[PDB]
Design a protein around this ligand. Structure first.
Ligand SMILES: [Zn+2]
Lengths: 57, 44, 303, 356, 587
């Protein structure tokens, strides 16, 4: 469902981390690029510094 | 009306085994509103 | 006489698709032989590939060579004769109408009733008229009535939102009274962009791979709300929350945001910027015939 | 959670409950008599007692919505009220009389004969149909002049001699050429058609010229908004067979307008986390000197539109009038083209034979 | 939008529609819930001679009746589109399509004629002079294999039959007959439907072969084959017809309207774009007409069905530099009870064509304009009802027509005098002695309702609702308001309890569909309506308000005191849990 932004005030009150999601574009390659596979992954929600470019604030 | 959306401030009440979230917004954190009740304080 | 925008049906049609793909499989099985369940239908339908800005097609050049007759009469009826019988078994369990249906589709006839035509009933025939009047009034530029239609439609507990361009043009020529246009568009996008089978897509869809309608439509139309100017850094900040990031065309939307911001060393970084996203949109997709036009423009800028 | 194997009781209690709900709405909103209720408690009492004098976990129960309507009609007809099946069809298809759900979110002729054998019509109730108001309903429904009420009333007397009943019921199901078209109303409609056809196409005193058949046809054909015609459009939308849906294709902007009116009124009688998400989702885009004229107004003005009252291609005019009439009847009395013409066919040979 | 703001919210034009202009032209188990695969009529200008001459608009039609015939004749155009005099010739089998082609202005704008059929495939030549037409059947070929050819495309006779195809050539004029080489086949065991189709694309040796699953580009005279870019998934190829001198293509697939066309010279697709128009109807065909102007070149897209006579239209335009856009759907009907087998074509728009309909040997020129500045019923099911007559059954019908005609005379002259007496002292005498006359009989039946009350096995007593056997009783009054007053004072009279009670007004509601308080305003309303018409209104309207008020006269069972008796006496014999199932006043 269409996601909502998370403001740290929520993270404080819920006593959770304030984290952004971490994403990796991963090249799975076989035989020196003879065959390769691009697949994006998620390594988990990553804590984010407040008032930074990834902070909604 | 015991409760308040921690976000949109919308007043609400709940029930037993009810989704905890703002029926309007859906924020799953809720506040307990203060109601008329007799509390004593000394002015000292 | 137009496609209906509700989930087709329950009924027979499943058992018909059963008969169809089951028989299909028996014939194709014996056919590779001689060349040497929802799930049966699933594997069956499965093993098969599933001066202007044209998403050019893939043309013929490295493709294949010629074949020469496979199928006389006496030899086709070979492959036909057995699987038709195995079909004689569960045909014994489907209904008369679908006996005759399978019979005829197997003779190679083609039905001249539709799944809509034969799904009878007070309520659906009413929806059929409601939606017709919708499509008609919208053809007629009768945006007011049209709107009334659309509203009573979506009110009905059956219609899925497959009629959005319905509003996206309807509410669009209806400046009058209602939040509209972009309202609907970016609404659609925000709601149907996450996790939060048939009866589907190209103009509706979910995540993990791309989503024509809502996405590209708000995603240009907001840039048209900036041709309303002569906003951008917003559209490109939240455009600048990928990833699906294989949405190459959205890469070109991004580069467009930069050519519109470009319209001092700031303006430099904006033209540097568009120069970058145009080729990261050589990702692939395929737009803009000569990027040297985009770049001749970028030199009119470079002045 | 839910009852087992003897929820026969809860079944009969939502059924009984839903019936009484419908009666509340027909005495209240349709100004029926209070007597209807006791008439209904009696009939549904009779058949409740008969299923509870064949009650067994080896259960054979078939209480359908059709049964509800069947006992309303059954009871009305003992009471000789001038209500007819088509009243009921209009009523239920218009979401006015509650129907088309189990408890909203918080074949008729055949089930009336079926119930009509289930408990016996003959020595418990009076199952004469209220014939003459059916005639009046019918002449007014066309714009036929009041002579045709007596015209048909005559042919009626001629074949039947005034007597009309409700069972063609012996439990049997294998029926062919025996006892079918034995539900009366259908024969009345058949007679009605026949009358217009003989009567017109054979009055050599043709008081009725080469052309007023046409003007009749056109004043019949003119789509014009009253409650009634609007209704028949609303019925047409849920009638099984084409052409009667090509019809909504051919509606006039006024017809479509009173349509959307009825739409937003009686689809506030609509049915049926994400639920409130669509409560808001829909409440984003907005749900929301008297003009159009009454029945006898329209009726008057077509009677006048023919008031210039004072040659085998008139057989044509006869035929298209008949077929238009027919169509209105098919949607109005929920039957098939082929059903109707089976009946009028049978009973027209039944009139030739008892005159020839 | 796309180009206008690439260049750095509404349509180009205003709201255009669609009008008619019509003319007459030609006039020639148990399972029809399916249909075969066939088309069946052409009209095209072709060059007969070419000793510096022009083209002549020809029709090739089908006399059928008994299946098997072929018609040719010229049509002088101007505006009212006609013929002169006919010329005809059959073949021993059934015609499946007549087609006649024209490659465009690369060349020599000419043709001749071709047609394909249930077990035979033929091609004809023609010469013509003085308004007679003389054509000339270059030999058939009965079906070499016992197959059957879907489509012909066309100096190259190309056949397609249930998968496998062949390029081939026609003879020059005489006896020698038509050969082939370079064959091939598409084939797809899982294509149950029998139709496949072949048509040129670009011009030099690039064909398209179709089945309701896929689109196959085949470059013969090289060796080449491609499955284009969709197939066999969410939609069916429903039709394809080639637009444009050579390089244009129009494909109907479910709701997508697809314009393909050329690029890189040969051999290409277009994912330029499409509109989507809305069914599941296997029958659906398309045809294009083209018109010109300086700033565009527009294609009008006709998608039509076999199920309803609506025609569904879209419009594209061709801008010099391979450029196409669209605008908004529009759809028309025409006369009902049937559907079309031929729709075919040739600040405002003129589009014009002809249609044939299912089972009507009839060709109609049509013409459609932008604006305005300038049932033959043979329903065999019903007429078979409305005649069903020998001669003694024609006069057998006339019998009772006369019978109730003179009878209706009896009614008229009878009632007339009663109408004379409307308010006499006499009619008061009658409404009196009649009113309490009735009352005496009404008491009598109430007594033999005493004697048999103890039944309590039913609640509908005997058979009640009548004038109660006086036949003199009813008919003889004339005033309606003094008869309504009679009844109001009779209901008033038997107001002594345990009696039927019923209230007419609330029920006339069902009749005139408005509140009908008095018995009288009922007569008023009907009398307005019928005084407008055939009037003996005053009389009849009185006579039928009399029949209704009789038919409804609430003479009936003893009340409440007697329902609540059988209600409980059956409510008992039903045991137990059903004694509580018998529940009322829920909520
Ligand atoms: Zn909230």
């Amino acid at each position: 469902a269409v996601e909502r932004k998370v403001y740290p005030s929520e993270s404080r009150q819920r006593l959770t981390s304030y984290r952004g999601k971490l994403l990796l574009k991963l090249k799975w390659s076989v035989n020196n690029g003879e065959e390769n596979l691009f697949e994006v992954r998620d390594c988990g929600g990553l804590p984010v510094m407040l008032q930074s470019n990834r902070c909604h604030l | 009306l015991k409760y308040i959306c921690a976000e949109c401030s919308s007043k609400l009440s709940l029930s037993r085994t009810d989704a905890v979230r703002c029926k309007d917004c859906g924020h799953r954190i809720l506040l307990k509103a203060r109601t008329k009740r007799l509390v004593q304080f000394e002015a000292r | 006489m137009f496609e209906v925008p509700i989930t087709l049906t329950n009924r027979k049609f499943a058992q018909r698709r059963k008969l169809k793909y089951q028989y299909i499989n028996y014939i194709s099985r014996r056919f590779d032989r001689i060349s040497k369940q929802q799930k049966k239908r699933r594997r069956e339908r499965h093993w098969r590939s599933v001066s202007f800005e044209i998403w050019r097609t893939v043309s013929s050049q490295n493709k294949q060579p010629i074949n020469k007759q496979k199928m006389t009469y006496h030899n086709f009826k070979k492959i036909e004769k057995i699987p038709l019988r195995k079909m004689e078994i569960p045909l014994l369990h489907c209904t008369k109408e679908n006996k005759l249906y399978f019979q005829s589709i197997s003779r190679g006839l083609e039905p001249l009733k539709t799944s809509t035509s034969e799904v009878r009933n007070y309520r659906t025939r009413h929806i059929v008229t409601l939606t017709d009047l919708l499509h008609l009034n919208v053809s007629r530029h009768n945006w007011s009535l049209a709107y009334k239609i659309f509203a009573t439609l979506i009110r009905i507990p059956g219609v899925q939102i497959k009629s959005l361009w319905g509003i996206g043009v309807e509410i669009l020529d209806n400046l009058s009274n209602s939040s509209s246009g972009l309202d609907f568009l970016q609404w659609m996008c925000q709601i149907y962009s996450s996790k939060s089978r048939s009866i589907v897509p190209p103009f509706q869809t979910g995540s993990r791979t791309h989503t024509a309608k809502f996405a590209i439509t708000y995603l240009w139309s907001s840039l048209i709300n900036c041709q309303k100017s002569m906003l951008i850094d917003k559209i490109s900040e939240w455009v600048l929350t990928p990833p699906f990031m294989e949405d190459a065309e959205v890469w070109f939307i991004y580069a467009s945001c930069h050519l519109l911001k470009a319209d001092i060393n700031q303006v430099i970084k904006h033209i540097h910027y568009v120069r970058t996203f145009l080729k990261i949109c050589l990702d692939k997709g395929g737009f803009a015939v000569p990027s040297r036009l985009i770049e001749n423009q970028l030199k009119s800028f470079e002045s | 959670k839910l009852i087992g194997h003897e929820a026969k009781l809860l079944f009969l209690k939502s059924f009984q409950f839903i019936l009484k709900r419908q009666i509340r709405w027909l005495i209240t909103e349709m100004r029926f008599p209070k007597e209807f209720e006791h008439v209904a408690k009696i009939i549904w009492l009779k058949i409740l007692k008969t299923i509870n004098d064949q009650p067994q976990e080896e259960l054979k129960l078939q209480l359908h919505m059709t049964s509800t309507i069947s006992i309303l009609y059954l009871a009305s007809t003992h009471l000789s009220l001038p209500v007819y099946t088509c009243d009921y069809i209009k009523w239920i298809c218009t979401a006015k009389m509650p129907y088309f759900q189990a408890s909203e979110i918080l074949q008729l002729y055949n089930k009336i004969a079926l119930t009509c054998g289930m408990i016996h019509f003959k020595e418990f109730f009076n199952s004469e149909i209220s014939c003459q108001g059916l005639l009046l309903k019918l002449v007014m429904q066309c714009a036929l002049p009041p002579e045709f009420y007596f015209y048909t009333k005559q042919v009626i007397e001629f074949e039947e001699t005034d007597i009309r009943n409700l069972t063609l019921w012996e439990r049997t199901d294998e029926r062919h050429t025996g006892r079918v078209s034995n539900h009366a109303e259908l024969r009345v409609l058949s007679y009605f058609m026949l009358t217009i056809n003989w009567m017109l196409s054979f009055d050599r005193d043709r008081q009725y010229p080469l052309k007023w058949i046409l003007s009749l046809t056109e004043s019949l054909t003119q789509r014009t908004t009253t409650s009634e015609s609007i209704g028949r459009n609303i019925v047409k939308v849920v009638y099984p067979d084409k052409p009667t849906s090509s019809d909504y294709f051919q509606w006039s902007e006024e017809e479509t307008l009173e349509f959307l009116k009825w739409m937003e009124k009686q689809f506030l009688p609509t049915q049926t986390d994400q639920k409130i998400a669509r409560r808001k989702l829909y409440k984003i885009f907005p749900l929301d000197s008297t003009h159009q004229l009454t029945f006898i107004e329209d009726l008057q003005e077509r009677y006048a539109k023919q008031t210039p009252f004072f040659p085998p291609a008139r057989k044509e005019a006869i035929g298209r009038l008949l077929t238009h009439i027919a169509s209105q009847l098919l949607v109005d009395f929920a039957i098939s083209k082929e059903q109707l013409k089976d009946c009028i066919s049978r009973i027209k040979n039944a009139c030739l034979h008892r005159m020839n | 939008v796309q180009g206008a703001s690439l260049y750095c919210t509404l349509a180009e034009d205003a709201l255009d529609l669609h009008i008619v202009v019509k003319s007459l032209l030609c006039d020639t188990n148990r399972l029809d819930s399916q249909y075969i695969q066939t088309a069946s009529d052409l009209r095209n200008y072709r060059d007969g001679t070419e000793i510096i001459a022009y083209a002549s608009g020809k029709t090739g039609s089908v006399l059928n009746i008994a299946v098997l015939t072929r018609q040719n004749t010229l049509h002088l155009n101007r505006h009212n589109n006609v013929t002169s005099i006919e010329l005809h010739s059959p073949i021993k089998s059934i015609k499946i399509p007549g087609a006649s082609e024209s490659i465009g202005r690369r060349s020599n704008l000419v043709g001749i004629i071709t047609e394909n059929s249930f077990q035979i495939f033929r091609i004809e030549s023609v010469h013509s002079r003085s308004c007679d037409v003389m054509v000339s059947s270059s030999e058939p070929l009965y079906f070499v294999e016992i197959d059957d050819l879907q489509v012909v495309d066309f100096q190259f006779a190309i056949i397609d039959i249930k998968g496998n195809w062949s390029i081939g050539r026609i003879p020059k004029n005489f006896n020698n007959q038509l050969i082939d080489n370079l064959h091939g086949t598409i084939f797809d065991p899982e294509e149950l439907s029998s139709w496949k189709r072949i048509e040129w694309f670009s011009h030099f040796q690039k064909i398209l072969v179709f089945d309701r699953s896929k689109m196959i580009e085949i470059d013969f005279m090289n060796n080449w084959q491609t499955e284009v870019v969709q197939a066999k998934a969410w939609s069916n190829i429903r039709d394809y017809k080639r637009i444009d001198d050579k390089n244009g293509i129009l494909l109907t697939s479910r709701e997508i309207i697809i314009v393909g066309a050329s690029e890189s010279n040969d051999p290409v697709r277009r994912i330029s774009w499409k509109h989507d128009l809305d069914p599941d109807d296997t029958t659906l065909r398309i045809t294009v007409q083209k018109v010109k102007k300086p700033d565009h070149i527009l294609l009008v897209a006709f998608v039509y069905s076999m199920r309803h006579k609506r025609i569904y239209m879209h419009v594209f335009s061709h801008r010099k530099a391979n450029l196409f856009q669209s605008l908004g759907c529009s759809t028309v009907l025409e006369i009902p009870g049937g559907t079309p087998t031929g729709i075919e074509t040739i600040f405002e728009l003129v589009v014009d064509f002809l249609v044939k309909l299912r089972n009507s040997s009839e060709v109609y020129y049509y013409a459609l304009s932008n604006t305005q500045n300038s049932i033959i019923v043979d329903h065999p099911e019903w007429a078979s009802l409305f005649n069903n007559a020998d001669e003694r059954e024609k006069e057998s019908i006339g019998a009772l027509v006369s019978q109730i005609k003179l009878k209706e005379r009896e009614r008229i002259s009878r009632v007339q005098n009663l109408i004379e007496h409307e308010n006499s002292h006499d009619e008061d005498k009658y409404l009196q002695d009649l009113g309490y006359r009735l009352s005496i009989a009404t008491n009598e039946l109430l007594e033999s309702w005493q004697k048999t009350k103890d039944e309590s096995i039913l609640s509908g007593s005997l058979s009640h609702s009548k004038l109660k056997n006086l036949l003199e009783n009813s008919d003889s009054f004339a005033s309606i308001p003094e008869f309504s007053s009679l009844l109001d004072q009779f209901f008033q009279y038997y107001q002594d309890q345990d009696v039927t009670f019923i209230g007419f007004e609330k029920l006339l509601h069902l009749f005139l569909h408005e509140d009908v308080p008095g018995l009288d305003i009922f007569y008023n309303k009907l009398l307005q309506c019928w005084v407008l018409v055939s009037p003996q209104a005053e009389l009849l309207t009185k006579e039928i308000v009399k029949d209704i008020i009789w038919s409804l006269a609430r003479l009936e069972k003893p009340s409440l005191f007697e329902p609540i008796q059988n209600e409980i006496s059956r409510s008992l014999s039903g045991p137990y849990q059903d004694i509580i199932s018998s529940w009322d006043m829920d909520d």
